[PDB]
């Protein structure tokens, strides 16, 4: 060819000047007879202005550029031969980029069982090929270089030596400058990230049910690093983690005893280790290990109650002993059986063993002293006493001021304590139905409670016959029966209206009561509506306590149609139609 372009690899920082040359050899100069005057510089196949083109000698021409912005500039010097024929001589590509900056954030981490890894941030984009080399050396020896293959992180090839200070730094070099960051002097033992402990085992204690001893093993580089741990524990239903005080787990150890735990409850544990001196980095969380606490003696004795059916004319009376099981929060384990003891204050104790919830025994007419206590694997519960008085005792003290009202979908019942010392309160309730008897449901409350809600699965639009019976030290108190509703609703069907008598200008109207399963609430009034074929609608209202009601303003020889509806607190429902003749 005619020559080359100097420089061959033009790299100029954005915001500066640039000037290139294109020398022509004498061979092609004599062959084509085209001097340096017919040259036409082309940048990306575009004609350049003649103002920036200047010739210096017979075989050299120069062009200038001010503040190039285009990153990839294809500079080609071409001569124009005879006949306006353009011929290419040489072509190069000019790059535009600014030099890099001083790197920062020089940190290094040493994983357990791996080489040292260092990272840093590059900063800004240089738009050019830039290599990052990581240097490392001791005070008297040098180590091989870490050339970043991709990105910014670089993993060294040598094995880390502990207890020896090392100084590292990274140098950034490109086609426009070389700059090195600041050096850091650290100890490879203070940057170790240990592996999470494994084989975590949770063991309970038969003597102390409120403790859970932990057991785990740590690598510690073969016993070189004294590692302190962080223990977190939680239940199986909660999502938050409760952390033990870190001061208690500062000494190097492989076991810890967690105290103040709930008996007969499962827990989940996890642990992570770090160097004793507080330096380095916290390890990842270990595998979750499960552990169940040991059982313990139950705290509260189960609820107890008795029911006696009327059996007149017999020496022995049949009594049905009933009692409920303890929840998993108070039983502290699996209930095995329930023990009962009966004695009439003077005889021997008769012991039974019933694994169920009920027991029926035949007792005589004298006073009995019963005792019930749930038995567990480790021991028995408290002995709850409930005597049985003789059938010839009349209750002298009863409860007063009984009232119930539904609030927040809960039927709350309140009462006033009797002037005598009571031991506990018993509440009983069941649905009211005239087609089938109700099931017996009960609950036991302490003596200090005077207002509570029914703990059970109640149904709306149903009448619940609530009964409260106080329990004294010598026997139960009075028994009163009240009625209440949880969520009243309109009745399903209206009352059947019949005519008892008809007269010349007067007529009484009768009706039947709405059944309990059909009331769906407490009745308040009764609406009687009547109208003839051409007359106007007239509505009268009568109270629920009335059954017969005489209708006035009745004309003779007129057909009349009556309609009666029953309205409750949640609306009303119309009844069937009836028509009577007035003679």
């Amino acid at each position: 060819p005619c020559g080359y372009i100097y420089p061959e690899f033009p790299v100029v920082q954005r915001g500066s000047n640039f000037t290139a040359i294109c020398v022509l050899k004498e061979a092609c100069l004599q062959h084509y007879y085209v001097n340096a005057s017919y040259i036409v510089w082309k940048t990306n196949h575009a004609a350049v202005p003649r103002e920036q083109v200047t010739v210096i000698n017979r075989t050299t021409s120069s062009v200038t550029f001010t503040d190039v912005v285009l990153p990839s500039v294809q500079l080609t010097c071409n001569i124009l031969s005879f006949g306006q024929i353009e011929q290419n001589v040489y072509g190069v590509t000019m790059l535009s980029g600014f030099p890099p900056d001083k790197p920062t954030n020089l940190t290094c981490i040493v994983n357990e069982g791996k080489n040292m890894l260092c990272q840093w941030d590059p900063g800004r984009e240089t738009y050019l090929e830039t290599n990052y080399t990581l240097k490392s050396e001791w005070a008297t020896e040098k180590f091989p270089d870490c050339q970043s293959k991709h990105g910014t992180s670089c993993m060294v090839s040598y094995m880390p030596t502990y207890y020896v200070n090392i100084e590292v730094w990274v140098e950034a070099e490109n086609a426009l400058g070389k700059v090195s960051s600041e050096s850091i002097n650290f100890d490879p033992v203070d940057k170790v990230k240990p592996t999470p402990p494994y084989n975590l085992s949770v063991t309970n204690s038969e003597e102390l049910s409120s403790i859970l001893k932990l057991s785990w093993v740590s690598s510690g580089l073969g016993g070189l690093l004294d590692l302190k741990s962080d223990i977190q524990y939680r239940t199986k239903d909660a999502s938050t983690w409760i952390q033990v005080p870190l001061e208690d787990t500062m000494s190097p150890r492989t076991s810890f005893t967690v105290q103040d735990l709930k008996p007969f409850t499962e827990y989940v544990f996890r642990i992570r280790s770090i160097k004793d001196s507080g330096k380095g980095y916290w390890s990842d969380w270990s595998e979750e290990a499960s552990g169940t606490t040991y059982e313990d003696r139950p705290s509260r004795p189960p609820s107890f109650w008795y029911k006696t059916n009327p059996s007149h004319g017999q020496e022995y009376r049949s009594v049905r002993l009933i009692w409920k099981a303890l929840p998993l929060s108070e039983a502290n384990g699996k209930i095995l059986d329930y023990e009962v003891i009966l004695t009439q204050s003077k005889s021997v104790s008769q012991t039974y063993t019933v694994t169920g919830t009920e027991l029926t025994v035949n007792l005589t007419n004298d006073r009995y002293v019963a005792s019930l206590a749930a038995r567990n694997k480790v021991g028995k519960s408290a002995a709850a006493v409930l005597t049985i008085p003789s059938p010839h005792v009349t209750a002298a003290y009863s409860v007063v001021n009984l009232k119930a009202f539904p609030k927040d979908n809960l039927l709350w019942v309140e009462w006033t304590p009797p002037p005598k010392p009571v031991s506990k309160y018993i509440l009983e309730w069941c649905v009211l139905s005239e087609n089938a008897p109700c099931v017996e449901d009960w609950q036991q409350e302490d003596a200090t409670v005077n207002r509570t809600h029914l703990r059970g699965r109640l149904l709306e639009s149903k009448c619940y016959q609530i009964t409260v019976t106080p329990v004294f030290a010598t026997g139960p108190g009075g028994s009163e029966s009240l009625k209440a509703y949880l969520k009243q609703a309109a009745p399903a069907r209206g009352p059947t209206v019949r005519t008892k008598k008809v007269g010349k200008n007067e007529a009484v109207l009768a009706w039947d009561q709405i059944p309990v399963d059909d009331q769906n609430g407490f009745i308040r009034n009764y609406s009687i509506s009547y109208r003839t074929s051409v007359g106007k609608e007239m509505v009268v209202h009568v109270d629920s306590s009335h059954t017969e009601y005489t209708l006035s303003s009745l004309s003779s020889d007129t057909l009349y149609m009556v309609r009666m509806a029953a309205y409750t607190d949640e609306g009303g429902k119309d009844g069937p139609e009836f028509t009577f003749t007035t003679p």
Binding site: T161, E167, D187
Partner: protein
Amino acid sequence: ANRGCSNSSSQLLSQLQNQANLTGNTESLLEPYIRLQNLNTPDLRAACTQHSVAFPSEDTLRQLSKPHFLSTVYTTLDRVLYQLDALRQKFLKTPAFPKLDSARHNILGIRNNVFCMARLLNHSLEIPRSTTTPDVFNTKIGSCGFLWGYHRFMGSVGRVFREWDDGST
């Protein structure tokens, strides 16, 4: 030069004590070499303990001053490095015995630490062959004795470092 071994002295002393306690352990280099060369017979262990290389005793190291002690440690570590290099050039098997490279790196680290400690005290340290083997049993016995003496010397140096840390005059 000034690109390492910062002015902290207590950290350097702690590092030296830890390195001495780590190196002065028969499980590091002696026991693997004994289990590798099939020298588990009690008579072979007695022959190992009999032939011992003359190393500086504990009383001699305790009687010397601090700079002389540092110089003696430097020279002894240099001799140990030379002997380990000779054993490596005679064994002709690198992959089956990495404890040699581990001990070599540990000795180099101890040498760097003691040089930095000597520089901190404004003291100037003193600045200064056949591959084939006719017999193998004598070479094994000599290497065993040298390793035993080296472990004893490392233990003595660790005890002297502990005494120095206790004194701290």
